[PDB]
Amino acid sequence: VLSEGEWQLVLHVWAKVEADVAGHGQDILIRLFKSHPETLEKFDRFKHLKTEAEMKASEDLKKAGVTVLTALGAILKKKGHHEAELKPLAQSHATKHKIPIKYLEFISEAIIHVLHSRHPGNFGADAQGAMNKALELFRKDIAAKYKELGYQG
Numbered sequence: 001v002l003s004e005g006e007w008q009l010v011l012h013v014w015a016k017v018e019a020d021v022a023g024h025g026q027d028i029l030i031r032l033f034k035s036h037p038e039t040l041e042k043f044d045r046f047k048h049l050k051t052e053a054e055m056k057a058s059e060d061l062k063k064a065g066v067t068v069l070t071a072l073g074a075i076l077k078k079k080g081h082h083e084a085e086l087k088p089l090a091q092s093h094a095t096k097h098k099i100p101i102k103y104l105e106f107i108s109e110a111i112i113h114v115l116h117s118r119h120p121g122n123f124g125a126d127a128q129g130a131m132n133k134a135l136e137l138f139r140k141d142i143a144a145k146y147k148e149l150g151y152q153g
């Protein structure tokens, strides 16, 4: 369980993501795909992209990033009270997309990596720790819902 002070560190760096969610989503998805190329395979619409330049130029990739980060932002703003938001997400990701927990770990790593690069002003050590706690809570609660849904994840 996060403290309120921990949540405020998370929310202060999220406010900067929100200056330009599309740009942040491009950087985060591209880092994911570069670090763990197998994750790209899950995205049928743009799994054929070969290079970072292609990825940067992809409107479909850009929209996915916006979708992902906006949904994450809504979860973070709940400050752990995210049961409603996680239901549909867990169901789709378990049953339609088939996203394992290890791939959620990989995107969490990409989010931290990009925030650390972009936002040294709001992503020092305490803030990074708070964001890791928030992302760990997200993954723990999604993993519990995957189990309810029948998915080993």
Ligand code: HEM
Residues within 6 Å of the ligand: 039, 040, 042, 043, 044, 045, 064, 067, 068, 069, 071, 072, 088, 089, 092, 093, 097, 099, 103, 104, 107
């Ligand atoms: C912070 C973690 C994540 C969040 C908040 C997030 C959220 C979303 C949302 C809101 C959608 C659209 C609605 C839906 O289908 O449920 C979506 C679709 C999708 N997600 Fe995620 N997701 C996350 C991580 C991932 C990861 C790591 C992958 C793959 C490695 C992934 C693969 C996809 C795919 C393939 C789609 C469908 C794209 C399409 O048809 O346009 N998700 N996700």
